Symmetry: C4
Subunit: 388 residues, 4 copies
Amino acid sequence: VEYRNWSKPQCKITGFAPFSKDNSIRLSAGGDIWVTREPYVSCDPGKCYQFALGQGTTLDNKHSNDTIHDRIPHRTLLMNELGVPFHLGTRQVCIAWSSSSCHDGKAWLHVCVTGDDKNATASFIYDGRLVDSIGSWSQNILRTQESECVCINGTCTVVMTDGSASGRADTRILFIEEGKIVHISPLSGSAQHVEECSCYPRYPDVRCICRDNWKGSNRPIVDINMKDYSIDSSYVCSGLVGDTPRNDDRSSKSNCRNPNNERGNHGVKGWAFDNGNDVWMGRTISKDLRSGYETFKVIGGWSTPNSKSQINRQVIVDSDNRSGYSGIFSVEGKSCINRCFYVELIRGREQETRVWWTSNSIVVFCGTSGTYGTGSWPDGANINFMPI
Amino acid sequence: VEYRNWSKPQCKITGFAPFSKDNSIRLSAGGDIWVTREPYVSCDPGKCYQFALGQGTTLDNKHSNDTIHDRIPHRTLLMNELGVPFHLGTRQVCIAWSSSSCHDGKAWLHVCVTGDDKNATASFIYDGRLVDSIGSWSQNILRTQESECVCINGTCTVVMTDGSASGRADTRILFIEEGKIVHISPLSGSAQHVEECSCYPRYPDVRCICRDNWKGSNRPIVDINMKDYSIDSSYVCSGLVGDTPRNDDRSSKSNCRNPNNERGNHGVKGWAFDNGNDVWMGRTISKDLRSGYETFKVIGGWSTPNSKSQINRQVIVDSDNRSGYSGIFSVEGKSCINRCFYVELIRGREQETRVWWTSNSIVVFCGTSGTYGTGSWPDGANINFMPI
Amino acid sequence: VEYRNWSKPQCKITGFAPFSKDNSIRLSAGGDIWVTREPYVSCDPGKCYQFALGQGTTLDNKHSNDTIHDRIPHRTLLMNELGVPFHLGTRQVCIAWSSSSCHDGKAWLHVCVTGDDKNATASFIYDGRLVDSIGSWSQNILRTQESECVCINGTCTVVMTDGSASGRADTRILFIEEGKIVHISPLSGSAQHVEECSCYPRYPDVRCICRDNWKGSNRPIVDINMKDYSIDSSYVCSGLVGDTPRNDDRSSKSNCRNPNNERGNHGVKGWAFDNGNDVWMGRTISKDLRSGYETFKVIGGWSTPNSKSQINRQVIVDSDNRSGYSGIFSVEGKSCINRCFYVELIRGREQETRVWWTSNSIVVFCGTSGTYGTGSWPDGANINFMPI
Amino acid sequence: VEYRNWSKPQCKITGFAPFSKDNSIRLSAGGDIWVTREPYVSCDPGKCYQFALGQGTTLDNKHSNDTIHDRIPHRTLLMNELGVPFHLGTRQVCIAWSSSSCHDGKAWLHVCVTGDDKNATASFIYDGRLVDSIGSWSQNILRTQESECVCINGTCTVVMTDGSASGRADTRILFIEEGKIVHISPLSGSAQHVEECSCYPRYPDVRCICRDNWKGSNRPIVDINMKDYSIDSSYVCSGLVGDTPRNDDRSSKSNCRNPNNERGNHGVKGWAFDNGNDVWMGRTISKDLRSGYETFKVIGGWSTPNSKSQINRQVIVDSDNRSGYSGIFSVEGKSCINRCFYVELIRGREQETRVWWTSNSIVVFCGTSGTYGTGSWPDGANINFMPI
Ligand SMILES: *[C@@H]1O[C@H](CO)[C@@H](O[C@@H]2O[C@H](CO)[C@@H](O[C@@H]3O[C@H](CO)[C@@H](O)[C@H](O[C@H]4O[C@H](CO)[C@@H](O)[C@H](O)[C@@H]4O[C@H]4O[C@H](CO)[C@@H](O)[C@H](O)[C@@H]4O[C@H]4O[C@H](CO)[C@@H](O)[C@H](O)[C@@H]4O)[C@@H]3O)[C@H](O)[C@H]2NC(C)=O)[C@H](O)[C@H]1NC(C)=O
Ligand SMILES: *[C@@H]1O[C@H](CO)[C@@H](O[C@@H]2O[C@H](CO)[C@@H](O[C@@H]3O[C@H](CO)[C@@H](O)[C@H](O[C@H]4O[C@H](CO)[C@@H](O)[C@H](O)[C@@H]4O[C@H]4O[C@H](CO)[C@@H](O)[C@H](O)[C@@H]4O[C@H]4O[C@H](CO)[C@@H](O)[C@H](O)[C@@H]4O)[C@@H]3O)[C@H](O)[C@H]2NC(C)=O)[C@H](O)[C@H]1NC(C)=O
Ligand SMILES: *[C@@H]1O[C@H](CO)[C@@H](O[C@@H]2O[C@H](CO)[C@@H](O[C@@H]3O[C@H](CO)[C@@H](O)[C@H](O[C@H]4O[C@H](CO)[C@@H](O)[C@H](O)[C@@H]4O[C@H]4O[C@H](CO)[C@@H](O)[C@H](O)[C@@H]4O[C@H]4O[C@H](CO)[C@@H](O)[C@H](O)[C@@H]4O)[C@@H]3O)[C@H](O)[C@H]2NC(C)=O)[C@H](O)[C@H]1NC(C)=O
Ligand SMILES: *[C@@H]1O[C@H](CO)[C@@H](O[C@@H]2O[C@H](CO)[C@@H](O[C@@H]3O[C@H](CO)[C@@H](O)[C@H](O[C@H]4O[C@H](CO)[C@@H](O)[C@H](O)[C@@H]4O[C@H]4O[C@H](CO)[C@@H](O)[C@H](O)[C@@H]4O[C@H]4O[C@H](CO)[C@@H](O)[C@H](O)[C@@H]4O)[C@@H]3O)[C@H](O)[C@H]2NC(C)=O)[C@H](O)[C@H]1NC(C)=O
Ligand SMILES: *[C@@H]1O[C@H](CO)[C@@H](O)[C@H](O)[C@H]1NC(C)=O
Ligand SMILES: *[C@@H]1O[C@H](CO)[C@@H](O)[C@H](O)[C@H]1NC(C)=O
Ligand SMILES: *[C@@H]1O[C@H](CO)[C@@H](O)[C@H](O)[C@H]1NC(C)=O
Ligand SMILES: *[C@@H]1O[C@H](CO)[C@@H](O)[C@H](O)[C@H]1NC(C)=O
Ligand SMILES: [Ca+2]
Ligand SMILES: [Ca+2]
Ligand SMILES: [Ca+2]
Ligand SMILES: [Ca+2]
């Protein structure tokens, strides 16, 4: 077994093709399925796995009541092969109300945060054993990516934040070797608030597109130098911005450098990736709510401030259906590294009627160099058919 | 590991012996089991797997209502070891309302079609990653075999159709290497309508027996030259024809060349294979409905037009019981390549109105050079005992 | 990997120690568990598996009604790791209302009989593929061991019967190499009726203790010469006889040669094995019904006609509780071959009329050279707590 | 594969970080989950497993009624990967109402005790086969650790007791090689009553911290010399004692040598381990009941009699929530051997009378050389939401 280097060029991308869907909520109405949120996907060299934060209960279960809450002690990281729904045989990998996972070519690293809001613990589990832990540095909800970390040549990197969700916070980039923290770098650059980074290998370095929860509806970028541990940060150049909420395309802005101060407060986890001067990105179709999901390329969207010429739009989830968090993962092919993404399809309380639970399913798409058509792949559950 | 070549002679066939049965619908009445249709079987070098298109729901589940519909975004390809029923731990391999799968000796290829009727996408997944995709070419339900594809020396072939189900359509034969489409050939020859091909290795080439949904109740043949990608097509010579609907045995015809224009409209997926001048074939026992299932050899049925001398009949499913789609798969033995088949046993709507769902179980038989008796192996569920 | 030879001495045996129990029926009252009967155990070189004939239904399921019947088309052979109860993820290995399985050191052989009573088919599946089949030779319920077959140096042997259960029948011993029948020997010797043999390796040969359903309450022995395929048969010498029904211990007889003509009609599958002049055997505690289970050694019980000197009695299931079929399996240790056995614990109809189903659990014990105490390990389900 | 030697220094310990939680009871209210008690954790060289004694039933099952009883024939040892809850696919490894398991680097050993109170049998199963057995030596509930045994250089050791729970008993230390008992040593030293030992490798020897059920609320130590099989015993020096019940912290004593005669009767399984002159230990927060769980270091707690200076306290389960048994396990890291522990979280009768069953979930923590915060990770089930 060799460490992954991800040392191939990025695949040609013309858009995205359907990859996986789990139908979690539909199945929940006729079977014992975990209540989850904050899912993601990560692949070992051979196969892909779906992850999510359980709520310590199945859906058709009185304990599913009031699972809207983000942090309870019973949350655990679930891990199944991609497309295997979270049934009762699912392994709970660690205790976590915030997580990141990645495979270095040899073994899995899991970063699992749990405990009190003001004094959380992050556990670092590698190759099936606890190797390290760190306590809260800002005493205000130590937290991490909710998507895959990235490892190059045996060094894995993960972005963590501690502090205010509505002001200056303390973001740190950890470097981890076989589960052991070997270095911690403070966030540097012009990103002013960084949450829930979606990171990808860009050999020899790592690049993250994140969520600004404070003043930006444009998405921050964090660049991680894997050689010298230096950090840089800015914002996606695209004038078509990626956060929710955001201004309408009529009036939205990004200058590549600063939070745009356009409905900056709050946000949603999302992703983008560069191809030369262009950017491929996803966002909710609604500028207001976590409804619908679309992808497109913005011509000059990586390099030209305020660029707004999009092309190659695809609807993933139509605007009449719920989405949620989304994130990137990378898959090594024969000659190139492909970029894929998942969309969390949130169902239940409070937005929807009848039910007392909050859960999600997932849909997953992967970059293609080929051709494709159109469709919409929403959660598909009928709220009227669900146990409450 | 080496690529499969299937470079052994076809096994001696005296008939077929029982191989597998999943009892899906019986189990559905007391357990959480997927609603499915369009099942098939395919084996890696070591063991066989059962596949089917899920309906994104279990049977004992309000979402099972109105699962008669062929295409919804929630359909996914399920894959279990043969004889493991589709329980909640089943892996959903891809998003698909039409599919084909095969193993090349090294890894699995899945061809998965989903999306809008007028603009579908086929994804090509190999060794657990998306390698290619193609969009609809005729804007009219791009679709494929619903049974195993065939790979020789690292090149896999699959037949796909796009266009009318009741007139001239656009059928293409794809050649795929490690998930990448390397060549596409148009259908050629005298077959006038080709659907749902059941294909098998006939080293060094591939041979398919398909469904003519337009003018033929005789089954089309598609011959695929794996060296130069050339295509030929015609019809099974046997005067005992394989489609449903069809004329009675007394008045049925085939001239090997043309659709017989005998109750040609509509059809059912099925199979046949050659042994010299003779043909082994299955069909529904009913000439009108998907009821019963029988196999037999037609003497001269491969090479003599309108041959009707049958022998070695076996009842697989008696005529009082429901069948459905059927297809071929091939299994490599020590010295020869064996031919096996599965039968889909459809239950529920529209025919059975006590329940609101549509699903199936499977029964599977394999070629034998030995001896055997008689029986009948239907679905076996009591419709009155079923959750509705 | 090498073929198993079983070429080690039989382990020292002082009695039996508890090995496994599945609690199938207790679990059935709170979970989806297969209805079964005719279970057995067989181990590959690494680990042991439990097998049984499913009834194509779970217990808490309307299809469980009237599962008293021995032969329906929906019966399939189930196979799990030993101690894993027959849940919905259990693999159905083949279609079978009578079966035998064994591992030759390289792969599994399964002998699976199904179809019409007067014209059954036995399928021979090896290394995951159908290799051979045979039809009924006496047109009267072709049938086999319901316990493990035995393979030495790549040749597996299995005993099959076709014909009357209450008169002269046609018993044959098959020799099978990688799934292919290479020789068939007729029964020879003085055993007059042979059913449901429990066989074990006695290098270089195989020895079976069976059920005489006709005139004997003493158990037949079948000796299989693996070199020249010759067959011999007689009866266990022990005056303490192993069948049910039987006479009481005071009046029972065996002359080693002939059926004893003591309540000879009917019987139950069981086992015994030799150690020099002595025999280790199990039997139901009741002489009338399949109630209770005991093991003991009979001193001179292998070599001395009508020997009744028992020692080392152990209660496996107390006489207040139901038993059923029992059979032998063999397990290779470091320096010796151990003998183990399972007991089928039958619940439901016809004896227990509150419920409409018939099913079983299992308990398993293995030979020990050590020491042990006493107990009773019955099924343990409360019939009043069961779904009916 | 090589035998484990555990020949690395003990890892630096600053405290404990969260590792695993199974949420068994919460899940039981919406899924088929085993009723258990007496859980533990043990890891092979790659992966950790959770074990527990089943009650031969699921929770939502009428058979769960009156599972307070410790010993029934239906109890079996369950084994899943750590964090996989005990679903219906769980393997029952052996018949056991008392158990210990460990991996020697090559294979699993299981020590499983079952049968009559006055005449129990312990089975020794290694590498999937029964290798040895021993009967009761004191005719009074032969019993063992309820946590992992320890193997060094292919020799595994386990502590067993037979005799009174409230007076002088007969404790023996067994030495087992590939499942075969090679030596038995009587308890020696000043420990006067030894139950339910929590043992760990301290190369080249093994050290156990146990439960005195008779005169001590201070915990006994058993030291096992793996070279000459000699045994020593005493009591943990710490004046902060580990048993429940016990005196309050102000009035509790230990002299390292004798049971303290302070509320000595009864107890609970627990653990401690040495670091130089200091001791790391866990205990219930309540001095009266199995409620809450805390860990801390006692400075001089290993070497100084009646030492009471604690530091590095952590709450694992707050005092408002139920705990139960706890035990140690050891995990080999790159350069050191880590110490971890599990806590049994008991729910139901007799304390909670709304329900009729008794079961548990688990939470698991591992030693860390890093930093951590605070929290509480109780069972989390709402008794009012449970099937009774
Ligand atoms: C079968 O499947 C294939 C493959 O999926 C389909 O082909 C794809 O079809 C897509 C839709 O036509 C196409 O993407 C489009 O590319 C064009 C550039 O050629 C781009 O303009 C499109 O983006 C606009 O339209 C979409 C809706 O389609 C809007 O959501 C989006 O916001 C864009 O609209 C904005 O810009 C327009 C142009 O300036 C304005 O006219 C419009 O009012 C709107 O303006 C707002 O935003 C501006 C900033 O962007 C701002 O200045 C202004 O003030 C407003 O605020 C879209 O990306 C794919 O390229 C194509 N794929 C391929 C490979 O060919 C095919 O159609 C399917 N066929 C069927 C029958 O199903
Ligand atoms: C135990 O098990 C074994 C193994 O399963 C059994 O042996 C098998 O038995 C099969 C049935 O006899 C046998 O297959 C038959 O082979 C003969 C040739 O030898 C063939 O004629 C049979 O086909 C006719 O009969 C079946 C029903 O059995 C019909 O479904 C079929 O359509 C055929 O009937 C048509 O042709 C006949 C002859 O011309 C006409 O009499 C009949 O009316 C009908 O005519 C219509 O169709 C014609 C076109 O074909 C058309 O010209 C006309 O106008 C009408 O429309 C069948 O294939 C197996 O070979 C044999 N297997 C082996 C290895 O021996 C055994 O019986 C079992 N034993 C018991 C006691 O259960
Ligand atoms: C703790 O556990 C250990 C290990 O499990 C226990 O030790 C075991 O204890 C067993 C019972 O004592 C013992 O087996 C016995 O061995 C003697 C020979 O030494 C043998 O005679 C015993 O067999 C008789 O008794 C059993 C009931 O125990 C009957 O079921 C059986 O049919 C036998 O009864 C017949 O023979 C008797 C003597 O000849 C007659 O009195 C009786 O009426 C009956 O006669 C009928 O059968 C005859 C043919 O057999 C026939 O001629 C006559 O006309 C009648 O029809 C039994 O096998 C184990 O050897 C021993 N194990 C070890 C390793 O020591 C220990 O007791 C446990 N302790 C506690 C307190 O739980
Ligand atoms: C964020 O998380 C971090 C990491 O978890 C937190 O840091 C940890 O904080 C712990 C609590 O302060 C600390 O452990 C403590 O260490 C001190 C020594 O420095 C030790 O004295 C503490 O033990 C006492 O207090 C705990 C409750 O905290 C009691 O349960 C315990 O019994 C001890 O109290 C007894 O002794 C005291 C002093 O002698 C008495 O005042 C008290 O009444 C009580 O006396 C009884 O027992 C005596 C025998 O011991 C007996 O003589 C007398 O008669 C009475 O019966 C505790 O171990 C950790 O070291 C620290 N961890 C690290 C790595 O720094 C941090 O606080 C969190 N952040 C925030 C803001 O909360
Ligand atoms: C959920 O819990 C709330 C109490 O917070 C209660 O009012 C409501 O009835 C519960 N829902 C159900 C379905 O029991
Ligand atoms: C299925 O849906 C139809 C149309 O809404 C309805 O009439 C029928 O009652 C439904 N079936 C069940 C069993 O709910
Ligand atoms: C089982 O079937 C019999 C015969 O049809 C019937 O009398 C009985 O009520 C059935 N049992 C149940 C529980 O439905
Ligand atoms: C449990 O058994 C007891 C004694 O038979 C009975 O009083 C009680 O009702 C049972 N509990 C349930 C929930 O059936
Ligand atoms: Ca924002
Ligand atoms: Ca047709
Ligand atoms: Ca008899
Ligand atoms: Ca005590």
